[PDB]
Design a protein around this ligand. Structure first.
Ligand code: 6I4
Ligand code: 6I4
Ligand code: CL
Ligand code: CL
Lengths: 340, 340
């Protein structure tokens, strides 16, 4: 049993956040597999150890619960799996293939962590209550835990996608934002029609300030952008349809994509009746969003992961706006990791 | 010299926040002058003492500066002026008249406190720097100091306006929000034309969710609402005109007034080119807004004073939205005072 020793050792290192350029360089060609392996066999234990150390610092009433113990056991095994490759020779192609297989196993091992943590939150509410102090501590920990998870899965996805034997792994250097908006809308519309037998239309407007006629493209991870937009579309469609049940006119959902000098901003606007300001905060709360999902708080973490943000503003009695803020320039797109 | 003794004694009491109903009851008729006098001769020393105690807890490098010493001297004299009436008989009409005169003198004595504090902020930046920690401490203190000042001047205005010998002092029980919007726009337009020789048009839309055809009215302090809207209009017009200097089309400023079950929300929208998210926070910072004004941070305090808020969201390359959040119901409209 060396896991506590491993956690203590690697938690002494700070994680190394990567920029988009570094991600592109790692994924530029298959010749970089050895470089990716040498980087990851060190970086992954550092990122795993730092969050694992924070987990062990949780109060005993949280640490001893089955959900936390289960998740911690997954992290311990994944940490130990990566340790086997520290002494292995990068020049051996068998080492590289085994490392890629190990990463896929690690990724699959953690697939259910989000619902597992949600179960823990519900247990905490029923076992100790839902006071504001508990909400803040849970919010602080889960935001960091999930942001850490996003960063680790990003590293694993880039290695496995690229070194399997235009797009650079999960990164699209020429991501057309409006196309991703349409994809997320279409998926949300399909679910909306199945459940409600009615769906708002989509209106997309683009504002390219520097080049008015040019479609807006960026370097980004389209799956992350899809996840944020899909979650927002689901909320906007549900609100729009339900608030107009006794009405015939169904207002469309309006999306504006704006490209500025440093911001690429996406605003989604509905006329779904709005939310009082008092209730806005609870929409992003893990504790208050638990009931006997976490789409919005996690969506905000995806936005923050590359130095962006996700903000919500409503007008009760009318409708709601959500804005995804992203960095327009790849030079400004850098991993945001929990501060340890 | 009893000022330190007075500060210590009355700082042991919590301020008593008043609701709109209590304000209306105090101002209902001239027969309440004695009740207002008995309440205020106690409440004003409590509110003055609490902020004065916080001032004395500032670090010596701030406390000893001429600006803080000047403001503190004004507070000491105003506190001493109110003390004279503690032992006086409310039944004597001369006591009531003298008390009203004393309040007017106190109000005038503090007229220049905002520019005086701004001078102190500039001195601090030049004498010690503009680090983030200094900005946060200055922001924390000034928000509380100015909110305290707003609450004290509200109490003084209600007494002096009503007991001078539809509207209840500075409170309009039937404030038409759109009329105040138009007034603030018209004033901002007049200044805009003088300086720029061009001004955006105004478009007001009202959404009365419960009663679609009814104009939106509320119980509020129209001067406070005017101050917020006027500051927002000035920023929106400046941005709109300057960003379209080399253009012929001048987009209008759009205002939506929405009345919900508990929120009355006012959104102002411009197409003034927007602000990057990174720079939004500095717009509300006293330290970063100082240069060799404070309209936005103080405007937000006016919104917060009766349990509201003022939020800003921009889309760089396009334009900016500001939303004033107010409580729709007088029962929910209660003074928000600094927590001591
Ligand atoms: C009534 C209601 C409740 C929650 C939400 C809502 N409307 N719209 C939402 C949106 C729209 C894209 C802007 C996003 C997230 C939650 C809500
Ligand atoms: C370019 C720029 C800078 C600052 C502001 C701006 N536009 N609009 C503003 C507004 C509009 C009502 C929404 C308010 C406050 C500051 C700004
Ligand atoms: Cl995980
Ligand atoms: Cl003052």
């Amino acid at each position: 049993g060396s896991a506590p020793k491993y956690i203590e050792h690697f938690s002494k290192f700070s994680p190394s956040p990567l920029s988009m350029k570094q991600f592109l360089d790692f994924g530029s060609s298959n010749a970089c597999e050895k470089t990716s392996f040498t980087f990851l066999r060190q970086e992954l234990p550092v990122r795993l150890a730092n969050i694992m150390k924070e987990i062990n610092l949780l109060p005993d009433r949280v640490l001893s619960t089955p959900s936390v113990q289960l998740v911690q056991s997954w992290y311990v095994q994944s940490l130990l799996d990566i340790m086997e490759f520290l002494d292995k020779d990068p020049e051996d192609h068998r080492t590289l293939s085994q490392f890629t297989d190990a990463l896929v196993t690690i990724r699959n091992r953690h697939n259910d962590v989000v619902p597992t943590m949600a179960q823990g939150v519900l247990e905490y509410k029923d076992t100790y209550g839902d006071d504001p102090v508990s909400n803040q501590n849970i919010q602080y920990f889960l935001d960091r835990f999930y942001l850490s998870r996003i960063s680790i899965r990003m590293l694993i996805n880039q290695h496995t996608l690229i070194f399997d034997g235009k797009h650079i792994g999960s990164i699209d250097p020429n991501c057309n934002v409006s196309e991703v908006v349409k994809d997320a809308y279409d998926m949300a519309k399909l679910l909306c029609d199945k459940y409600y037998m009615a769906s708002p239309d989509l209106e997309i407007q683009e504002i390219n300030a520097a080049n008015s006629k040019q479609p807006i493209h960026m370097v980004y991870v389209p799956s992350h952008l899809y996840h944020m937009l899909f979650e927002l579309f689901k909320n906007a469609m549900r609100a729009t349809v339900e608030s107009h049940e006794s009405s015939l006119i169904l207002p469309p959902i309006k999306v504006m994509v704006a490209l500025g000098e440093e911001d690429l901003s996406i605003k989604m606007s509905d006329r779904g009746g709005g939310v009082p300001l008092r209730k806005i905060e609870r929409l992003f709360s893990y504790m208050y969003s638990t009931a006997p999902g976490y789409g919005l708080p996690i969506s905000r973490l995806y936005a923050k992961y590359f130095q962006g943000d996700l903000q919500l503003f409503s007008m009760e009695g009318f409708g709601t706006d959500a804005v995804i803020y992203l960095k327009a320039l790849s030079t400004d797109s850098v991993e945001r990791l929990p501060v340890y």
